[PDB]
């Protein structure tokens, strides 16, 4: 997956997440046409309770039917302040998308981070199954780990999560200022 974010001078904003699912999709190209096919069928529940590429499970609601669209986790998002564009945000990461995008938004609104800080900030993740609190390297110091472990979390350090491209828009006297951030995780 990959996410991109656009905001123009007039107040339009477009947040696009799109994908062929896995890296290089199904790995099969259409001969003569030069493009890779998606493996988006794996986003269906192919058997009740069977975990997919992201450890997500399902049953009837996300079962396969002809013409049906497989359930996604993609969360292209726009946040408004007084009905005006404030944030344009999104990310790849399958099951991790929802939690990555949540954290960036919270980092701005709750903690008053600038958009670069909000994106670079270490991320955690809980997706119920597996029953683990996933963290990033150097992302959680001993004191915090110990207190969360004492609560009952099984903390696991795994590869970095997400690749957020985000825009924050703020008013000025004449027009607006646009602040952007790519994600340091992009090349990991």
């Amino acid at each position: 997956t990959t996410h991109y974010s656009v905001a123009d001078r007039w107040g339009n904003a477009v947040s696009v997440t799109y994908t062929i699912n896995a890296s290089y999709g199904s790995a099969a190209s259409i001969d003569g046409a030069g493009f890779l096919l998606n493996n988006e069928m794996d986003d269906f529940s192919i058997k009740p309770g069977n975990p997919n590429l992201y450890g997500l499970v399902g049953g009837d609601a996300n079962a396969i039917e002809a013409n049906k669209r497989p359930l996604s986790s993609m969360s292209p998002t726009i946040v408004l302040k007084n009905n005006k564009v404030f944030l344009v945000v999104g990310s790849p990461g399958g099951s991790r998308i929802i939690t990555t995008v949540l954290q960036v938004i919270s980092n701005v609104i709750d903690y008053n981070m600038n958009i670069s800080e909000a994106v670079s900030a270490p991320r955690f993740h809980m997706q119920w199954l597996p029953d683990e609190l996933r963290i990033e390297k150097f992302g959680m110091p001993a004191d915090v780990k110990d207190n969360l472990t004492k609560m009952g979390y099984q903390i696991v350090t795994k590869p970095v999560m997400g690749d957020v491209n985000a825009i924050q828009v703020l008013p000025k006297t004449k027009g607006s200022v646009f602040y952007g951030s790519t994600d340091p995780r992009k090349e990991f």
């Binding site: 905001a7 123009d8 099969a28 890779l36 049906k68 919270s106 800080e117 809980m126």
Partner: protein
Amino acid sequence: ASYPPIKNTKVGLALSSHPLASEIGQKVLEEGGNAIDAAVAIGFALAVVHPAAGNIGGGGFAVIHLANGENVALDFREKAPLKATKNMFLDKQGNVVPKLSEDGYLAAGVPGTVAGMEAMLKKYGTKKLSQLIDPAIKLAENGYAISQRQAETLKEARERFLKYSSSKKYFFKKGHLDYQEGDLFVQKDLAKTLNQIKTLGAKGFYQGQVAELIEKDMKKNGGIITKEDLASYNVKWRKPVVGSYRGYKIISMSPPSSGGTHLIQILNVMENADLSALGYGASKNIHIAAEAMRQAYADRSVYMGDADFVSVPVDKLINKAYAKKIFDTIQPDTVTPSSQIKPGMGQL
């Protein structure tokens, strides 16, 4: 400490994960295009310069806020083909066939990206498709240098590519040699396809010669997508899922994504706490978020799918009273193990 944000005070920003695509989008803004024009240019550019993820063979979503205050969501998600069936990836014993949903032609839904790009351009853009797709065509025809990271991801996919005669043509050099960092990567057949789109619009992908190539290769390699699938592919303009968090409006993707619903659900739970008081990285704050996530993902496993086929209780999941009920179960000193979680808390 973090590097400073990118700043623009004139035409806005167009940001993607590939600098060549970002530059293309930014130039569209510099040349007087709107956010949709730039988004369309980026969608096609990434299909060339970021083939691990950027694509014309997949699909996705666009959430759009218009200058007139309207918020809309574009669904260009892939569709299961007409010949798809519930148990298509299972063997006679009802067990999953290894890799059948992952590698090759049966793993594919009907692509939506080209239809999505055209749909947003037609409804909300101001520039011509030819202007917006030309940069992508130029990069396909003339090539670009493989980055270190692309060399790495190509290597990781190498054995998958080698399963398919088509991919052996496109993702290896002469003599079936690996592409390496700094090699010029040229995509002549992709340029042909993009040129069909330039000349005929989306019909250049979903009908005619390209549709013929798709059906042919599908028939040859055990896939099921046909010209009928392609001619019947439809984007859908949907209402976004909308919520509020501390005086801000959250606009995100509705079914067939679960993302917007659970994003708003988890924020709703979190809204019951003054997170700012303890600040970033506090264990109390992480705990509240993580318990909200735990419930949301349990709910996802039962309630979420394509609402055109199944009933999806979006309004119940984003209800602030439900979020309050979730919040009130969160204890200061302990978690609720996933084994004890009930979708909807057993009361949805």
